[PDB]
Amino acid sequence: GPVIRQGPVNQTVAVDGTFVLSCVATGSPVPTILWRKDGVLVSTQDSRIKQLENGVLQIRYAKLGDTGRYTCIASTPSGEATWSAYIEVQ
């Protein structure tokens, strides 16, 4: 039954920079991690946006429109947990 030990954190980031959100979850079975941005499932297929190992979402060449609420969703056949943070690109 999943619990998020460390969700994403609030950040101010620079335009063109690379930032990440990380989401450290435990539970059995191991929680899968999903990202929403502003309520919509993030598209890790824009090529700026990468899902890396260890529950890291990485966003390269940050744009002003990447500002928003980012939510980590940690899911298990038992249940799910949630933790969000606000990112400001400037």
Epitope: T18, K50, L52, E53, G55, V56, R60, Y61
Partner: antibody
């Protein structure tokens, strides 16, 4: 056979200006993000520019932001770095490097040129 | 505010056939987003390890990358004279993509 050849290095005066070129061949240059990395005389390394495959996006760290401009010619397969307002700390070997396509897709540089020397004073 | 990478030792000399560990510490958790480069004298760096733990294509299995959180290791098993180089780690989590200052490996 992947090849990267930097040129355009030399000795310049403080506040001066230089433009480096990197000729690429042996790969589909228009597909790859490219970086410029420099190596100072103390042997430390520093990423100074990245540019994505179509030239649409560029990144520079604070140490060079405002002074360095990266651009590419995808038809002739050349990467450029215009450097201006140069300072003695900019003295370094400059490499152009290819960003690797990987899984997971961590940023990493798989092919590097042999570099071109820049000296400021 | 930028992520510091500290490498140890700064240099070392070891003998042929020895196994040698080089360490890289980050000032915050970097989640395996680390890469290792090898630079031989008068040459440009080459990719060794990506994502902390993945060996690059045409590189010897004598090299292995390990670690997690803030602590990473590059191990060189069965030291060979061609391993003479400076080894560098790089933070590839968030910009600036800072490099450790390098570990120079010599043969006695």
């Amino acid at each position: 056979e992947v090849q990267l050849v930097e040129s355009g290095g030399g000795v310049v005066q403080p506040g001066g200006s230089l433009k480096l070129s990197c000729a690429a061949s042996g790969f589909t240059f228009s597909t790859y993000d490219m970086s410029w990395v420099r190596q100072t005389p103390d042997k430390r390394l520093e990423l100074v520019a990245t540019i994505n495959s179509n030239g649409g996006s560029t990144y520079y760290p604070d140490s060079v932001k405002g002074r360095f401009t990266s651009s590419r010619d995808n038809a002739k397969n050349i990467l450029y770095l215009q450097m201006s307002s140069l300072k003695s700390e900019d003295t370094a070997m400059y490499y152009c490097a290819r960003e690797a396509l990987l899984r997971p897709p961590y940023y990493a540089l798989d092919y590097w040129g042999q570099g071109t020397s820049v000296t400021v004073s | 505010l930028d992520i510091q990478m500290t490498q140890s030792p700064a240099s070392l000399s070891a003998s042929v056939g020895e196994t040698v560990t080089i360490t890289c510490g980050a000032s915050e958790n970097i989640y395996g987003a680390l890469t290792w480069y090898q630079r031989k004298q008068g040459k440009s760096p080459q990719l060794l390890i990506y994502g902390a733990i993945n060996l690059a294509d045409d590189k010897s299995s004598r090299f292995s990358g390990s670690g997690s959180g803030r602590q990473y290791s590059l191990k060189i098993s069965s030291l060979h004279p061609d391993d003479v180089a400076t080894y560098y780690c790089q933070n590839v989590l968030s910009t600036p993509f800072t490099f450790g200052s390098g570990t120079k490996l010599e043969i006695k």
